Amino acid sequence: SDAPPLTLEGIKDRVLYVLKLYDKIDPEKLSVNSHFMKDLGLDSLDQVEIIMAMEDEFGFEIPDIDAEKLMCPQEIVDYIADKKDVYE
Amino acid sequence: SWDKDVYPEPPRRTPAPSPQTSLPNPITYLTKAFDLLVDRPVTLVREFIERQHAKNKYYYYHREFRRVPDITECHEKDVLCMFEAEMQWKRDYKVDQEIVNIIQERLKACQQREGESHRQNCAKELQQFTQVVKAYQDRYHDLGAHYSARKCLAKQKQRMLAERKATKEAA
Amino acid sequence: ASHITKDMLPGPYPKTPEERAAAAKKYNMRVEDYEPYPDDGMGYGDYPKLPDRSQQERDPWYDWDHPDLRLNWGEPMHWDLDMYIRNRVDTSPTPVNWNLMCKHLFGFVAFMLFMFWVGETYPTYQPVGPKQYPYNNLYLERG
Amino acid sequence: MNLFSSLTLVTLILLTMPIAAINFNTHKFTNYPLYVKTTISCAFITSMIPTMMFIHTGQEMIISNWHWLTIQTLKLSLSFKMDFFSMMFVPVALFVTWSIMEFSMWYMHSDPNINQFFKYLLLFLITMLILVTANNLFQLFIGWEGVGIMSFLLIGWWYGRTDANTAALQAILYNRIGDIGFILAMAWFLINLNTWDLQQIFMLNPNDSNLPLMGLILAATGKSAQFGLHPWLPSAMEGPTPVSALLHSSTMVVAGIFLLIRFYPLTENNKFGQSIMLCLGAMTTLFTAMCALTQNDIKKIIAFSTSSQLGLMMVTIGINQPHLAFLHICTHAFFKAMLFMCSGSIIHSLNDEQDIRKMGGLFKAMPFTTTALIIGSLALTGMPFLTGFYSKDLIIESANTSYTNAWALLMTLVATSFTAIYSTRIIFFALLGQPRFPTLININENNPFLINSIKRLLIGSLFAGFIISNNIPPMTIPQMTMPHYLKMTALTVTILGFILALEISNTTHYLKFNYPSNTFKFSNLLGYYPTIMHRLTPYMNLTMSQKSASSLLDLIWLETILPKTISLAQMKMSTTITSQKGLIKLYFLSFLITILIST
Amino acid sequence: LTHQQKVLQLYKRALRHLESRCVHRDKYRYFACLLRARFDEHKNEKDMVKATQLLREAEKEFWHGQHPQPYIFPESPGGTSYERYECYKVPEWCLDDWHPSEKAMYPDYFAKREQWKKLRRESWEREVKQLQEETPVGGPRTEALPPARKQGDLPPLWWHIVTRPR
Amino acid sequence: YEKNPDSHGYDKDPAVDVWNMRVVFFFGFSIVLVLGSTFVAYLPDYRMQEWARREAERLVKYREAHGLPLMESNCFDPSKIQLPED
Amino acid sequence: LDPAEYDISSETRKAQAERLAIRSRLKREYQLQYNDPSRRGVVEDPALIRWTCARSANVYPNFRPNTKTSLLGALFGIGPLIFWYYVFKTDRDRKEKLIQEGKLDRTFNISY
Amino acid sequence: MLKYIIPTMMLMPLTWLSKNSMIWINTTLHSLLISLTSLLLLNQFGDNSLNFSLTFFSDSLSTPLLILTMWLLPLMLMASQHHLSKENLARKKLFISMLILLQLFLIMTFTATELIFFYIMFEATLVPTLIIITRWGNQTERLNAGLYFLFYTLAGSLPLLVALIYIQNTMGSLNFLILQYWVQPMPNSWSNTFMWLACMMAFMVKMPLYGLHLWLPKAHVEAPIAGSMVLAAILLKLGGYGMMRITLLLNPITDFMAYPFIMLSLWGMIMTSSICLRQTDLKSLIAYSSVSHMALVIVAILIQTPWSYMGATALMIAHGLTSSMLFCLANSNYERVHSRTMILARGLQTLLPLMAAWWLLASLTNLALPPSINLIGELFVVMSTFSWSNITIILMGLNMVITALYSLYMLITTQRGKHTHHINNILPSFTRENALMSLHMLPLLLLSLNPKIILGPLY
């Protein structure tokens, strides 16, 4: 079975959750629209880290070429959304 | 009901059961029960089929083949005699084949019967085995695909001559 | 349709290299590729003018849908695809070690040196002068 | 006595299912997999009766049924050979497959192909049963290539994933080399003994058994995983877990040596034979000890462990102790079948990573599976006093003594030790540290299928080896007088490697940057890639030589058409000139009256 | 190919092999932190050749840090999955013909599916026009597929609506 | 590329197909496979080998009961034969 | 095999190799990429037909000029083959000898 | 036998005069009705080969091969349709007529007593096949591979007539019965050299030995499926058959003369078995397979042990059904996507989930699976050849491993690993395909119960 799917609410809560666990920036501004770099100015090497440990959160895929350009959180949710099987 | 002395069944020599200790009866419940469940319910049927067969009998005969002059009295050619000779040669041949089968099976059943005794009580039957299979080995063994009589008679010529020189060197 | 030129015979000098660039990969080093077909050909070894390539690994990496393993692309097939895909090795850095295995066979030949020599039964071994070994040897007497 | 005719019932009790799997084509939709399972148990009890009958009175009766053709001097029929090898084995096979089939009802519930799957796996079982019950060597051969191709299909269960079916093909390849050995043995038995009948070959003992029995060594080495041909197992992991379980326990890789055991009276002699035995099974023990460590796929660890075991059993056919081996096959079946059928609980429970990295600690809502892992681990360690001890410890006691070439004693020691250190690996990783792995725990132990499966297999295991213990009608003189330092080393080595590996991976300091050269030779300096890739190219080279004979054949025929090209010149030798053929035919015609003048 | 993905790739798979190295994840942490500094001192210099040089030095020094069985998450090519289920993927062009009986076995699916057949049968002219318009001569430069401006479908859609993984 | 609309479907163009599968499945599967398979299943004893078994049994029994060694080799009695000479 | 030297790509090789390479590629990607409705049969791509025709050995029937070719082929079917001729004839004749003299110890051989 | 000669000759006008659309029905029907009596043909017993009439008779071997032929027509013809299923009626009746006439000359050939009647009917068998594959073969450039193919035959295939007529006037009768009993030893010398070599190589051109094997592949890729099942299920077994009989004489000669050919077949078995591994274009794989098994047959013929024949003939029949069927699989795959190239499409475990079972089953029957007749024959042959040379098993069993590898490689990459998804044509199965497959395997699996029918004259 391996029953539970990842739904939109769930994945949202997850990317959102772990990005709130990232310490060096505050939960202050975190939103699917809230810009993943320009807002927080985080290192691009550090977004490589974000996609690293987030992949280790969901455990799959994420090729380097597509991982490069990801950015905003809603977008990450989208990539995981079409790659996994998500929508109703 | 096969012919007995062709296929020996030695004495059955069944041992006498001794309980020797007082316990349950693990198989014997089911050997009796089996002999209740699977013995009679089949036996009735086989017996009924028996009487059904027996109400109308048949008779079928084992064929015979008479003898002929075989290879000797045939002239070098003029097949009309030869055909009989060499084909019945082929019959007697297959007969010898099945003899070899019989002995070869006696040996197998012998070891299976003896048990761990493998070299005890098969010596006689293995002995006559080496006798027969050395005979077949000597006679029919190496000829080839195309063989009739001419080639068996041939090989026998070969041995008779080789042993005639062997018996002049016997001096 | 199968065009008048679907493949093969090389050897016309000047414009055949570019002609083979057409119908195949065409570029500087690709003109040198169709050309590398006629260079690898040299004197005829039964290989026609089909283009050339290397044995390096173009393999599954998740994008671009590479050659004939799973084919979304229409470029040249080289000579390989009857080798690679299903059962093959093709390219890697590789350990390239012929010692370690043959030095387990060192363990074997070491054994066969142990083959004529032996361990014995009881209790212990190699005080040896001309001592007994199993065959039970000399005399017999007690009294 | 005819209750052994019920023994030849049980085989048809197995035969029953596929007939249902074909003819009706509907009620199978009613969950027959349950039905298959029930047929297996029926075969287990109906197969259990004859064992009891034997172990009181013996009485092994071979039946030929109706004979297979005739041909010339040898009429080969077919048989079911009750050797106490069959009598004792078949309840084990049916029992372990009972487990693996119920577990499979838990494992495959999502897969839409489940029914077909049981058709295969069951059929695989039929090929096994017909192999281990047969005497007449042709029927051996039948079960042989049967279980072989079944290994191909089952390891190849997943269409696609080139890796999978590729592994399958390598497997069947090795089986087929084992086959070349086998049919060598067959042929020799014909020409020299004028039969292959497993009774008759026993009766007349060939003075020279060298060559054929060597062939038997080869055939054993093909399936049994033995040395010089490894890659079978580690890529054989690619099949679905239950198939892998059934593959390394009761079937196949044990059926390799099961043949050598079958011929044991013929291998009593030709100490050349036992020599090769302990020259080789040794090499698999310590080899797979050297190449087994550090590879991090749990299932694969389990594999290399079974390879090392099989080495130890080959060594048990060394000297003369075939029965001790046989017992160790049965016990091994229980223990490692347990180990896989739990490892699946780990894997599928985890989602599926099946890498020993990540994993986690022992008890996290996983009480019963981990219990199975220290019953099975602690079991396969060589046992302290537990069941399999009745195999392995006796084995190293007798092998520890007498005429062994003595390169095999140290082999036994460090072999079993590194088995214990496998166990220490899987505990120090899978069962030890606090959980580290992809989050969102999905784990579930709650389902009657698993708990009942592992349940029955462990309840049996600890009590099964004890029945097999002292019901083994004595076949030889046990050592039983065992000297100091040749006695006290059985358990003691398992503790020296136990402690040694314990302190190896315990209290580990900073681990970063470089690792050893041995760890790069622990994966391997290729015995997998060198032989597979290298041996893969050579047939293509022979295709180049084939282009030599083909290009030379159509180059010679092109020398005939070149002789037709320049034979047209023998036609083109005509100059088409009326002053040529007319006056030359007149001059050379007067040369027909010149040649006819003297001719 | 640019310095960006070059450096960033070496960093990423360096973290990967480092993951595979250690255990209990904390030692992995502060080691990965020492590495974080090892690239953290970097990047503050826009000198051109010095950089690629030192990178290559990290290419050898990295190549030392590869043990032969780096951890591979299941779904990519690797010893766990990479389409375990691949025999289960049946393309939607199959079932275009089943028997009309079984086509009646599930009466309402092919309704909406027929709305798709008409969706993309009505289409592809809008598609071919938009594409034949946009493409520069030969369409050499672009592997991409730019959207549609008018209200409607994105033109090369058909295969990109896929049989899903299991 | 002609394919079929697959109105039902079979071998050939419509309305004769049913008859086609009827004749080929019947005469092909029914009569020859089952019927013939019963024919050659048990036909009269082939190559005579059953007779060979019976005759072998009788003859061997005679050979022991009268004490002659069975299977004398020499396919033809040297009592009647002649040999070339050097 | 073993990516190494981390080529600096220069300038031409950058411009030429990039632009021309991915030029032709994307040309052909988009080419077979059409994937419209209304095609019932295969996509037929002219690729791999060249593979098949060439691998049908187009230069096989013509000729084989000498060079090293007759040496590679002749020596390719020479050494092992004719030596196997010699070994099967050898062991043949030996077998015949030990049959005709001494003993091969066949004893019971029979079916052969 | 004449009772089998009339009904097909009557089966000709059945074709010619008929209503359109019923030709397949009438031909198939009455042809199977022939197959029944073909199964009647087995009286064979005891020792003397039955003799129907003084012109032509049957021993064992002729009977299995004949049964296979008369069985094979209805399945063949049954298979050939939908290759066309559009044409003028004259094409259809011409084609079925040609298959008929071909069968007639085959029956003539197998039954023929006297070797000249055998030879006349021999080339008279070759012509109809040629007309079949050349007149429409799908003709890739046509290769002209029917015609100079007939030259590959006749080139060295004519002089065997010379040698025959020599045997005629020297000994009188060429009746096979009386050629037996009158056969007299022929010493080793240069005249008997050219003779033995004449007859031998004359038949050895048909079952290709590795030297001549270039014969098959082109001729068999250009053949329409009917002509293929004709060709490789039968027309090789003619060469091997006549070989079986004419080896009656040549008694000592075949030793010193045999040895080089034996060598060439033992090596070429491995070579051919190799080259068939790496090729594309599936239709060739089964061809070179046929070359391999036939090489094994020749090996079996020259060494004269009876075991060698039993395994031999068993291999003739088993390889006939197996190779034939497997061809028909290649075709049933070819109508789906027009390729002939193996690697092009893939999958078909997903799609056509039943057609799997026939791929698998047939490939296994060519994998030498133990109960399968193919392994009976191959097994006895390996026994014979090991008796001849203790050493040769390296080569034999090496053929076991390779034949395993390609025989099981064909089972994959056509049938497994992915669907290429740019196809979207293949229409699921047919009832006819299942009928053809079934009619192949089901008897090949049943024969694996009572094989003593198909084992050779010596048994």
Question: Which tokens hold the place of H22?
Answer: 């019923």
Among residues A13, A26, A43, A56, the one annotated as catalytic is A43
E and G touch with 3+ CB pairs <8 Å, answer yes
Distance between CA B142 and CA B144 in Å, rounded?
6
Tokens encoding C42: 């040299």
Half-sphere exposure (CA, 13 Å, Cβ side) for D25?
1
What is the DSSP code (8-state) at residue H56? B
Give chain F's domain count. 1
Q: Are C60 and D163 in contact (CB under 8 A)?
A: no
- Which runs of consecutive H residues, i.e. helices, occur in E25-152? 26-40, 49-63, 100-103, 110-121, 125-134
Domain assignments of chain D as residue spans, ordered by start: 1-523, 524-599
* H125, H105 Cβ separation under 8 angstroms: yes
Question: What is the distance in angstroms between the Cα of B41 and the nearest Cα belonging to chain D?
Answer: 15
Chain G: closest CA distance from residue F71 (Å): 14
**Is H42:H64 a contact under the CB 8 Å cutoff?**
no
* Contact yes or no for E20/E70 (Cβ under 8 A): yes
Beta bridge partners of H56: H112
Answer yes or no: are the C-beta atoms of G107 and B134 closer than 8 Å: yes
Which of D109, D348, D442 has the CB atom closest to A4's CB atom? D442
DSSP state, residue E163? P
Chain D within 8 Å of C122 (Cβ-Cβ)?
A: yes
Residue H391: φ, ψ to 5°: -85, -30
**E4-to-D50, G13, G17 alpha-carbon distances in Å:** 74, 20, 20
The distance between the two most distant Cα atoms of chain F, rounded to a whole number of Å, is 90
Dist. CA C107–CA C122, nearest whole Å:
26
Spatial separation of the C-alpha atoms in residues G31 and G45, rounded to whole Å: 10
Q: Is residue H307 a contact partner of residue H387, using CB atoms and an 8 Å limit?
A: yes
Measured between alpha carbons, how far is D247 from D147 in angstroms, rounded to an integer?
10
Cβ within 8 Å, pair G73-D552: yes
**Which two tokens mark D294?**
């550090």
Task: List chain D residues with CB under 8 Å of G61.
Answer: 554, 557-558
G45: nearest Cα among E148, H422, E103: H422
Q: Hey, what are H40's tokens?
A: 């009647």
The residue assigned the tokens 């029929």 is D77
CA D489 to mean position of chain CA atoms: 31
Does E79 reach chain C within 8 Å, measured CB to CB? no
In contact, C94 and D529? CB cutoff 8 Å: yes
Cβ contact (<8 Å) for D176 and H404? yes
Bridge partners of D80, per DSSP, are D63
Interchain contact, H81 vs F4, CB within 8 Å: no
**Structural contact between residues D91 and D132, judged by C-beta atoms closer than 8 angstroms:** no
DSSP H49: P
Residues in G closer than 8 angstroms to E159, CB to CB, are 35
Is D525 close to C95, i.e. CB distance below 8 A?
yes
Residue in chain C lying closest to G22 (CA): C27
Chain D residue at shortest CA distance from A11: D440
Q: Which residues does residue H112 pair with via DSSP β-bridges, in sequence order?
A: H56
What is the token pair recorded at H286? Answer: 């089964």
How far, in Å, CA of H371 to CA of H449, rounded? 8
Dihedral sign, CA of H17, H22, H27, H33? negative
- Is the CB of residue B77 less than 8 Å away from at least one CB of chain H? yes
**AA letter at D181:** G
Residue with tokens 């006093």: D385
Q: Which amino acid, residue D233?
A: L
Find all residues with CB under 8 Å of D234, minimum gap 6, and list them.
D295, D300, D303, D304, D528
- The experimental technique behind this entry is cryo-EM
Per the CB < 8 A criterion, the answer to whether H447 and H375 are in contact is no
**DSSP class of E78:** S
Most D-contacting residue of C47, C84, C87, C92 (CB-CB within 10 A), to test interface = C87
- Where helices occur in D506-567 by DSSP H, the ranges are 517-524, 529-534, 536-565
Tokens (6 digits) for H127? 């012509």
Q: Which helix H or strand E contains F64, and what residues bound it?
A: helix F49-65
> What is the three-class DSSP state of E94?
coil
- B16 token code pair: 């006498």
Q: Which two tokens stand for residue B119?
A: 């070299």
Decide: residue E49, CB within 10 A, 0-12 exposed, 13-18 middle, 19+ buried. Answer: exposed
User: Cβ(D138)–Cβ(D76) under 8 Å?
Assistant: yes
Place of tokens 């004419």: H246
Cα(first)–Cα(last) distance of chain E, in Å?
34
Task: Identify residues after which chain E is interrupted (C–N over 2.5 A).
Answer: none
Pairwise CA distance, residues A61 & A80, whole Å: 9
Which residues are CB-neighbours of C47 under 8 A, at least 6 positions away?
A: C40, C41, G59
D526: closest CA among C83, C99, E64, C105? C99
Distance CA F82, CA D451 (A): 87
Yes or no, beta carbons of B130 and G108 under 8 Å apart: yes
Q: Is D80 helix (H, G, I), strand (E, B) or coil?
A: strand
Biggest CA-to-CA distance, chain G:
85
Given resolution (angstroms): 3.9
- Token code pair at residue D41: 């148990």
Q: Do chains E and B touch (3 or more CB pairs under 8 A)?
A: no
Q: What is the 3-state secondary structure (H, E, C) of chain G?
A: CCCCCCCCCCCHHHHHHHHHHHHHHHHHHHHHCCCCCCCCCCCCCCCCHHHHHHHCCCCCCCCCCCCCHHHHHHHHCCHHHHHHHHHHHHHHHHHHHHHHCCCCCCCCCCCC
d(CA D322, CA D391): 12
> Is G50 near chain F, with CB under 8 Å?
no
3-state DSSP call for residue E32? helix
Tell me the residue length of chain E.
Answer: 166
Give me the residue spans of the domains in chain A.
Answer: 1-88
> Quick one: tokens of E10?
């070496």
Query: Chains B, C in contact: 3+ Cβ pairs under 8 A?
Result: no
A23 near E CB under 8 A: no
Q: Whole-angstrom Cα distance, residue H125 to residue H231?
A: 11
Q: How many residues make up chain C in this entry?
A: 143
Inspect the interface and report whether the beta carbons of C97 and D407 lie closer than 8 Å: no
Whole-number Å distance between alpha carbons of E74 and E78: 6
Greatest Cα pair distance in chain A: 42
The residue type found at D248 is H
- Residues near C124 by beta carbon (within 8 Å), at least 6 away in sequence: none
Contact (Cβ atoms closer than 8 angstroms) between residue H413 and residue C86: yes
Interface test with C, best of H214, H341, H343, H422 (most C CBs within 10 A): H343
CB contact under 8 A, H455 and D71: yes
State whether A61 and C63 contact (CB < 8 Å): no
Distance of CA B29 to the CA centre of its chain: 40
Q: Which two tokens stand for residue H177?
A: 């019965």
* Candidate from G60, G105, G111 with C-beta closest to D550: G60
Catalytic residue at A39? no
The rounded distance, in Å, linking the Cα atoms of D423 and B125 is: 56
The whole-angstrom separation of Cα D255 and Cα D225 is 11
| Residue D286, CA distances (Å) to C103, D298, H300, H392 in order | 14, 20, 45, 35
Q: How many angstroms separate the CA atoms of H232 and H76, rounded?
A: 12
Phi, psi of D550 (to 5 degrees): -75, -45
The residues, any chain, with a CB within 8 Å of residue H100's CB and separated by 6 or more, are H8, H11, H12, H15, H73
- How far apart are alpha carbons H425 and H427 in whole angstroms? 6
Q: What is the distance between the alpha carbons of residues H38 and H16, in angstroms, rounded to a whole number? A: 24
Say if residues C114 and D561 touch (Cβ distance below 8 Å): no
| CB-CB neighbors (< 8 A) of F55 in chain B | 62, 95, 98
Count, in order, helices (H) and strands (E) of chain A. Answer: 4, 0
Angle between helices G79-100 and H258-278 (to 10 degrees): 140
- Is H382 touching D (CB cutoff 8 A)? yes
Give yes or no for a contact between D386 and D465, defined as CB atoms under 8 angstroms apart. yes
Question: Under a CB-based contact definition with an 8 Å cutoff, are residues D200 and H456 in contact?
Answer: no
Residue E109 to residue E92: CA distance in whole angstroms: 13
Task: Measure the CA angle with vertex H400, ends H397 and H404; round to 5°.
Answer: 155
Nearest alpha-carbon partner for E81 in H412, D342, D353, D340: D353
Query: Do E7 and E55 form a contact (C-beta atoms < 8 A)?
Result: yes
Q: Determine how many CB atoms are found less than 10 A away from the CB of residue D527.
A: 18
Contact D72/G111, CB-based, under 8 Å? Answer: yes
3-state secondary structure of H112: strand
Eight-state DSSP code of residue H102:
H
Cα radius of gyration rounded to whole Å, chain B: 27
Tokens of C15: 């414009």
Amino acid at C61: W
Count of beta carbons in the 10 Å neighbourhood of residue D482 = 15
User: Are B70 and F76 a contacting pair at CB < 8 A?
Assistant: yes
- Among all chains, which residue has been given the structure tokens 């079948």? D337
Quick check: B145 and H308 CB within 8 A? yes
Backbone angles phi, psi at H56, to 5 degrees: -150, 150
Contact F12 H24 (CB under 8 A): yes
Closest CB to C93 among G2, G24, G55: G2
Helix (H) or strand (E) holding E14: helix E3-21
The minimal CB distance from H349 to the residues E87, E96, E159 is found for: E87
Question: For the CA atoms of chain F, what is the radius of gyration?
Answer: 30
Q: Does D435 touch chain A (CB under 8 A)?
A: no
Cβ pair H81, H72 in contact under 8 A: no
Residue bearing tokens 């730019």: E146
Six token digits for residue A24: 């060096």
Q: Can you list the pairs that E29-33 forms with residues at least 24 positions away whose Cβ atoms lie under 8 Å?
A: E31/D510, E31/D512
Burial class of residue C134 in the structure, from the number of CB atoms within 10 Å of its CB (0-12 exposed, 13-18 middle, 19+ buried): exposed
Task: Fill in the amino acid letter for D83.
Answer: D
Listed in sequence order, the residues at least 6 apart from D273 whose beta carbon sits closer than 8 Å to its beta carbon are D209, D213, D214, D217, D267
Gap between the Cα atoms of E61 and E39, Å rounded: 13
Q: Alpha-carbon distance C68 to C86, whole Å?
A: 10
Q: List phi, psi (to 5°) of D63.
A: -120, 135
Residue B116 CB contacts under 8 Å (≥ 6 apart), including other chains: none
- Number of Cβ within a 10 Å radius of residue D516: 8
Phi, psi of D406 (to 5 degrees): 80, -15
Q: Which two tokens stand for residue D258?
A: 């099961």
3-state secondary structure of B44: helix
Q: How far apart are CA D86 and CA D7, in angstroms?
A: 10
**CB-CB contact of H35 with H74 (8 Å):** yes
Taking the C-alpha atoms of residue A64 and residue E9, their distance in angstroms, rounded to an integer, is 7
The Cα D332–Cα D326 span in angstroms is 10
Region of H112 on the Ramachandran plot (φ > 0 left; ψ -120 to 50 alpha; else beta): beta
DSSP letter (8 states) at residue C15: S
Contacts across the C-D interface (CB distance below 8 Å): 65
Tokens 């086998």 map to which residue?
D182
Cβ pair D145, D179 in contact under 8 A:
yes
CB under 8 Å to D358, separation ≥6 — which residues? D436, D437, D438, E71
Q: What are the chain C neighbours of D526 within 8 Å (beta carbons)?
A: 94-95, 97, 101
User: In b/e form, how buried is each residue of E120-156, taking b as 16+ CB within 10 angstroms?
Assistant: eeebbeebeebbeeeeeeebbeeeeeeeeeeeebebb
The reply to whether H147 touches chain B by the CB within 8 Å rule is no
Q: What is the largest CA-CA distance in chain E?
A: 73
Estimate the crossing angle of helix D32-46 against helix D48-57, to 10 degrees.
Answer: 10
CB B122 within 8 A of CB B111: yes
